[PDB]
């Protein structure tokens, strides 16, 4: 309408003119005005005017909220206590109170650190529960903890919209954008509302992130009350870490109400639905066992044939092909080939005895030490191999009990805060033997046993190897794999300051500062910590080209969810070590076309370290473009390193703790061929 009968009405300050004209302004407030409220210059005088002053504050917040302001907009609302699904309430509430309470919660919530913002914040909570705009009002009211009472205040009817939408995009933005202290309120408030709600596996993800035994006990009495079982046993055991399967087996072993949770808390119900069904519904051929086990020569294709043969991917012909094939192999292929019968027996608990007992008490040392290694590989819940292997280990100098200590301590670590074998490993941690893999598999064994501790630990074994690490600073390979035991013992942190503790306690010459940056790699699992990104680009040009390799190697774990930021121009540099950093940052994902597109230019390189490292990540990330890269490597070479690694690619051409932790043992291949003794016993296999 025209402003002729209504424009000269707001100019006088008469009290009756307000008591009748202000309700008329409320009648015209259904659409605001005919235009963008150009009358601001004639209605701004009413700032100090007042008898129905709530209508004056409502018109004033209507126009100041209408055209432009940033602080004077919500003051009439916090002073008003609004009074007096229509277009009126949708306009003055939905958008005007959307931006209005957005900048009010921004200014007041980001200013002081009352009750008006809480009562009126709940007034907008109910008002938006009447207007019902999903995934917008919530994502605006994220930062005002009020999030907990807002979720338990709204999650009554809209379960799929707020849980699926809000928990999904607010979860992704709660690990990418929202910091950790609010994410704790997501974990516990979602423990509540998801504890009441159905669809338990999302709460099981809340057990993957919370690692709490009360949630899994309630989800096992509630998942037991609701009846299949083998599936949630499969991703139950997959989703659980090392902590909550022993806590799960201790409370499960306490009551568990049917003993079926004792049955589920072991390495039996994750493979009893998999192995026989995988043999039934799927079938593997003998082209790779027979082929890649038939064109072998030069004592290295026997290594790769012993590892690929050690893989299960039913057929056991190449193992049963007569005898002396292990005798024609090297010592590391005697540990690997002696552990092949163990690797092919991840199931059939009763078969490992009658299959490995042949290699036991043999004439060669690596046959029986690799046989105890196989005893550690075959199972993870039997734990009955402890006494025979540990009974003879007390030699500590040169006896077969040192390689039986490698296979038995590392394999026993695969079979497992176990403190008895830790006190038994205290003289082994303090052994200080010049053999690298003794404290290699000892530190990696206690670390892989202790992956998932509550904000890490400062136990006397990692502290023992810190003091003894300060005794003699020799054999830098210890300064490379001992920090792996350190940071793997510190695994499970979300905000722990142990990286600064070690940064104050163990810092020295570049070697133990490289240990410090290893703890930094094992200290940034991921949160809202953009300081690690500005520090990342800040330390991107450091002289020490190894702390860049590791600290930048942590890219596959820091930004492992926002996959758009990972592609960069790292390959365009001349620091081939950075090309290796991106090569490690590829990962083991589904392997999109961009990944293999990087494996092309990374595949074409002259140095045997990167040309040897590219088929490893190329094979791990891939699970008619499978046998063609093999012909491509055939076109590259036509050494033996790329031959063993290319047969590993011949096999493998077709947040989890155990599936991702043992990769750094493989990330130290730039050394003697002795790496095959530890590379063959990875636990990242499915």
């Amino acid at each position: 309408r025209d402003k002729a009968p209504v424009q000269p009405q707001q100019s006088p300050a008469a009290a009756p003119g307000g008591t009748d004209e202000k309700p008329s302004g409320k009648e015209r407030r259904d659409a605001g005005d005919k235009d963008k409220e150009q009358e601001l210059s004639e209605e701004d005088k009413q700032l100090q005017d007042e008898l129905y002053r709530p209508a004056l504050e409502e018109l004033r917040r209507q126009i100041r909220s209408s055209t432009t302001s940033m602080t004077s907009v919500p003051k009439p609302l916090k002073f008003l206590r609004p009074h007096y699904n229509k277009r009126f309430a949708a306009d003055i509430i939905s958008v005007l109170a959307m931006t209005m309470s957005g900048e009010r919660e921004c200014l007041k919530y980001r200013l002081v650190g009352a009750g008006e913002v809480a009562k009126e914040w709940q007034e907008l909570d109910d008002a938006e529960k009447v207007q019902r705009e999903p995934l917008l009002t919530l994502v605006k009211e994220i930062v005002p903890l009020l999030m907990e009472i807002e979720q338990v205040d709204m999650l009554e009817k809209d379960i799929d919209e707020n849980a699926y939408a809000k928990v999904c995009l607010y979860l992704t933005s709660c690990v990418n954008y929202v910091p950790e202290p609010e994410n704790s309120a997501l974990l516990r408030c979602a423990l509540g509302v998801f504890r009441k709600f159905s669809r338990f596996p999302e709460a099981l993800r809340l057990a993957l992130m919370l690692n709490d035994m009360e949630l899994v006990e309630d989800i096992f009495t509630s998942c037991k009350d609701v009846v299949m079982l083998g599936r949630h046993g499969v991703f139950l055991e997959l989703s659980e870490d090392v902590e909550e399967y022993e806590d799960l087996t201790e409370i499960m072993s306490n009551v568990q109400l049917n003993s079926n949770f004792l049955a589920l808390a072991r390495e039996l119900d994750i493979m009893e639905p998999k192995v026989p069904d995988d043999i039934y519904k799927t079938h593997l051929e003998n082209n790779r066992f027979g082929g890649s086990g038939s064109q072998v020569d030069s004592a290295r294709m026997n290594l790769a044939s012993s590892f690929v043969n050690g893989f299960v991917n039913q057929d056991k012909l190449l193992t049963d092909d007569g005898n002396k094939w292990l005798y024609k192999n090297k010592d590391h292929g005697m540990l690997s080939a002696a552990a092949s019968l163990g690797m092919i027996l991840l199931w059939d608990v009763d078969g490992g005895l009658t299959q490995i007992d042949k290699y036991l008490y043999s004439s060669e040392d690596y046959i029986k030490s690799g046989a105890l290694l196989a005893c550690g590989i075959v199972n993870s819940g039997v734990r009955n191999e402890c006494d025979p292997a540990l009974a003879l280990l007390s030699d500590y100098v040169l006896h077969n009990s040192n390689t039986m200590r490698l296979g038995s301590i590392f394999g026993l670590g695969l079979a497992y805060n176990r403190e008895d074998v830790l006190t038994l490993l205290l003289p082994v941690m303090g052994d200080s033997k010049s053999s690298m893999e003794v404290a290699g598999v000892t530190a990696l064994a206690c670390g892989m046993i202790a992956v998932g501790s509550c904000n890490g630990d400062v136990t006397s074994t990692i502290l023992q190897t810190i003091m003894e690490k300060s005794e003699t600073e020799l054999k830098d390979t210890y300064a490379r794999w001992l920090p792996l035991g350190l940071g793997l013992n510190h695994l499970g942190k979300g905000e722990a300051i142990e990286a600064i503790l070690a940064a104050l306690e163990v810092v020295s010459e570049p070697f133990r500062s490289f240990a410090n940056t290893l703890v930094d790699v094992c200290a940034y699992a991921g949160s809202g910590n953009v300081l690690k990104v500005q520090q990342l680009l800040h330390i991107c040009s450091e002289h020490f080209d190894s702390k860049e390799k590791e600290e930048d190697k942590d890219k596959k774990e820091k930004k492992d969810k926002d996959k758009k930021e990972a592609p960069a121009d790292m390959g365009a540099h001349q620091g081939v070590a950075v090309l290796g950093i991106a090569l490690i940052a590829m990962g083991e994902e589904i392997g999109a076309e961009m990944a293999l597109r990087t494996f092309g230019h990374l595949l074409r390189y002259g140095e045997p370290t990167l040309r040897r490292a590219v088929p490893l990540a190329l094979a791990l990330i891939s699970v008619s473009h499978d046998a063609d890269p093999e012909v491509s490597y055939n076109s590259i070479f036509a050494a033996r390193l790329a031959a063993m690694l290319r047969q590993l690619a011949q096999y493998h051409a077709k947040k989890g703790t155990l599936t991702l932790c043992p990769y750094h043992s493989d990330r130290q291949l730039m050394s003697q061929v002795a790496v095959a003794g530890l590379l063959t016993v990875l636990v990242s296999f499915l």
Partner: protein
């Protein structure tokens, strides 16, 4: 009727390095490959054998002679580029497709035959030529190029597209009332990706209306694309 033809080209061009122990022991060595030609052509045997041979091999795509005729007669320079990248890709399969004034076509075809014959290299790569009509090509190309084998495609119109249609529609879903008399009677100079293309745009055209059934008039409407495709080029 292509089983004997696909096992004869399978044994003809798959006797080399892919499973090689039956090639370097008897001492025959016809390292020249075959020259594909089909009476319908247009991707039927060219695409069918171009995708059927990719079980384990390295493919090299060369389709169309437009880049030579769309501008000045650059000639065998791109043949030298594909010959140095084919030299750097020796264990591959050279697949030249759509070989379609004449005073220069004869000299770039003479130089193409000379460089393609292997005048400066021994037999190491399998060269495959393809065209729509084997009669338009001058017979002077047969003796230097083809010394291994040349394959004819004696297709039974009902059982070639009914066997390829049956195999290619036994794994995926389709609609009813799919006629075949107008297909085997009218379709010519088209491929199996064209009957798959009109069954895919037929079931997809029914998917536009959110239906899983295709009407006969809709299969004739998609058939009109085949009716005009052969008359256009």
């Amino acid at each position: 009727g292509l089983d004997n033809q696909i096992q004869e080209i399978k044994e003809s061009v798959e006797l080399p390095l892919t499973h090689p122990e039956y090639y370097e022991e008897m001492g025959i060595k016809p390292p020249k490959g075959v020259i594909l030609y089909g009476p319908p052509g247009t991707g039927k045997t060219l695409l069918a054998k171009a995708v059927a041979n990719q079980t384990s091999a390295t493919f090299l795509r060369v389709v169309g002679s437009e880049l030579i005729q769309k501008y000045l007669g650059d000639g065998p320079k791109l043949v030298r580029e594909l010959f140095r990248v084919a030299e750097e890709h020796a264990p591959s399969i050279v697949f030249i497709d759509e070989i379609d004034g004449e005073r220069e076509i004869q000299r770039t075809m003479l130089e193409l035959l000379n460089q393609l014959d292997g005048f400066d290299s021994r037999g190491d790569v399998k060269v495959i030529m393809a065209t729509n009509r084997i009669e338009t090509l001058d017979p002077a190309l047969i003796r230097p190029g083809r010394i291994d084998r040349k394959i004819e495609f004696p297709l039974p119109d009902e059982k070639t597209k009914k066997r390829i249609f049956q195999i290619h529609t036994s794994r995926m879903t389709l609609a009813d009332d799919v006629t075949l008399d107008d297909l085997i009677m009218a379709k010519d100079d088209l491929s199996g990706a064209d009957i798959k293309a009109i069954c895919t745009e037929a079931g997809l055209m029914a998917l536009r209306e959110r239906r899983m059934k295709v009407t006969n008039e809709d299969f004739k409407k998609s058939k009109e694309n085949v009716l005009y495709k052969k008359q256009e080029g």
